[PDB]
Design a protein around this ligand. Structure first.
Ligand SMILES: Cc1cn([C@H]2C[C@H](O)[C@@H](COP(=O)(O)OP(=O)(O)OP(=O)(O)O)O2)c(=O)[nH]c1=O
Ligand SMILES: Cc1cn([C@H]2C[C@H](O)[C@@H](COP(=O)(O)OP(=O)(O)OP(=O)(O)O)O2)c(=O)[nH]c1=O
Ligand SMILES: [Mg+2]
Ligand SMILES: [Mg+2]
Lengths: 208, 208
């Protein structure tokens, strides 16, 4: 089974991935996790991050350029993903294709039924062959709280300064809204919307 | 030996590659040729071409986004290139790294000593590890004549309509000028500037 954890920056995704992995293992299931962007393993991913931190000229100013880099990263992970699926009972992805749809639409002030989301659907799932997730878990949190967590991380970790997307409060707000729409329409597969207080044990039961 | 043939659109590069390959073979040397962008073999290359023909939203509007796609294409060809070099006496590339430097600088109205060219140098040669060519042959031609050949191709071949760069006469002119500067400073390696009347036999002798 393939599960993707989605949400805005600072929503608490990384933590849910760890608590969820623990719950699945407590249930006797083998688990593997993979996070996107794959920093260090994908040139496209590294350039994307660097662009969001001020490098590479006008690259970051293009919504489709950034989306393409993230899609190229995932395109290079197809074999890895399929490999994990046949090797473990559960594979949890920290961000996946929906991240591209949500942020791209938000940067363009479009909704889930818009152009960017449709483009991501055509390119990543159909064209690049990325498998559709069995479940997509949206960790919905207030934009304010998520932003506070992003700011806090940067304050105590010099290696985690915020990037262009994280510093854009309005973008973060719009991204959360598109995410909610995507989940409501079951974009790319079945979704589950949870809060910060979700119980990892019951969540793993629903997913398993 | 690794040779790259450079020049603006419609300069006659593809033809020189064939005549040059023939000259080398007439001299008893084994030859292999590879053309960039690698359409069909690189997703990055295909998306780039599609963007120049009107697709993928605002992607083509970013100078660095386009340069990155072409660099990612070449990054995926490193093994192929090194393989050809150890398998054949001569490897001829139809366009290579300098194409990115020339067009990127021209789109930004910069010269060869500018930011974009320096960026291409840092990313493709040093960072991505693309080997520097032993020779870079600039097929210099008048912007007007080259443009006429581009228009002619589109007229007799529905599968070869011109793209955003080809329809930009001023860009083509500026690109030719940056190419001349690159050759003058030996950017990326030794250059040789030839005209449309160059003799393939003597050119192959100079290169071999
Ligand atoms: C994977 C993916 C991410 N993104 C966005 C979400 C974020 O705003 C931004 C960065 O990806 P993040 O996964 O947030 O990574 P990061 O670079 O912020 O790293 P860290 O967690 O160590 O601080 O890119 C997309 O727009 N599309 C995608 O397909
Ligand atoms: C390889 C490469 C090409 N280019 C530019 C040169 C051209 O204007 C454009 C297209 O590449 P071309 O090699 O011209 O290919 P094409 O798509 O025009 O195909 P055809 O010859 O079949 O008609 O991209 C770069 O800017 N950087 C690069 O690194
Ligand atoms: Mg982030
Ligand atoms: Mg062309």
């Amino acid at each position: 089974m393939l599960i993707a954890i989605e949400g805005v920056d600072g929503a608490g995704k990384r933590t849910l991935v760890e608590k969820l992995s623990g719950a699945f293992r407590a249930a006797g299931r083998s688990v593997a996790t993979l996070a996107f962007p794959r920093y260090g393993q994908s040139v496209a991913a590294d350039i994307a991050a660097e662009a969001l931190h001020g490098e590479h000229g006008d690259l970051a100013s293009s919504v489709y350029a950034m989306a393409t880099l993230f899609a190229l990263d995932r395109a290079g992970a197809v074999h890895t993903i399929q490999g994990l699926c046949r090797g473990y009972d559960v594979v949890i992805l920290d961000r996946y294709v929906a991240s591209n749809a949500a942020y791209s639409a938000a940067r363009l002030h479009e909704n889930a039924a818009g152009k960017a989301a449709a483009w991501v659907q055509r390119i990543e799932f159909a064209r690049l062959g990325l498998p559709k997730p069995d479940w997509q878990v949206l960790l919905a949190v207030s934009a304010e709280l998520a932003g506070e967590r992003s700011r806090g991380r940067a304050q105590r970790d010099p290696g985690r300064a915020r990037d262009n997307y994280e510093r854009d409060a309005e973008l973060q707000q719009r991204t959360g809204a598109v995410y909610a729409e995507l989940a409501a329409q079951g974009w790319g597969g079945r979704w589950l919307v949870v809060g910060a207080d979700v119980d990892p044990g019951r969540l793993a039961a629903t997913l398993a």
